[PDB]
Amino acid sequence: GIVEQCCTSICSLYQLENYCN
Amino acid sequence: GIVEQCCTSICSLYQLENYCN
Amino acid sequence: FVNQHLCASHLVEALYLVCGERGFFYTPK
Amino acid sequence: FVNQHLCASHLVEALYLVCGERGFFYTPK
Structure with a gap:
């Protein structure tokens, strides 16, 4: 999920946008 | 490094391009 | 601001x- | 092809x- 992708590893805009409505 | 970012976690174009000359 | 470790x-x-x-x-689990 | 787990x-x-x-x-260490 988002923590594994963006906190535990380096985030990206591509990944953040996966959590936009 | 690249394995932690792209193998162990999900890769992105932004991250791959960090390894282009 | 997005291409770094971001927590909490x-x-x-x-x-x-x-x-x-x-x-x-936002679903941290 | 880039937004997935890619190994080796x-x-x-x-x-x-x-x-x-x-x-x-390519520096896998």
């Missing part, structure tokens, strides 16, 4: 800035 | 396709 409220802030009026869901 | 030769392939004539460095 710092993560949330990035979602808020990126998603704008679309809004977002 | 599969990683290398993605670097090759993305970087094109710029070339790339």
Whole structure:
């Protein structure tokens, strides 16, 4: 999920946008 | 490094391009 | 601001800035 | 092809396709 992708590893805009409505 | 970012976690174009000359 | 390690409220802030009026869901588990 | 888990030769392939004539460095450690 988002923590594994963006906190535990380096985030990206591509990944953040996966959590936009 | 690249394995932690792209193998162990999900890769992105932004991250791959960090390894282009 | 997005291409770094973002945790907790710092993560949330990035979602808020990126998603704008679309809004977002935050599921840390 | 880039937004997934890419390991070993599969990683290398993605670097090759993305970087094109710029070339790339591959340092797995």
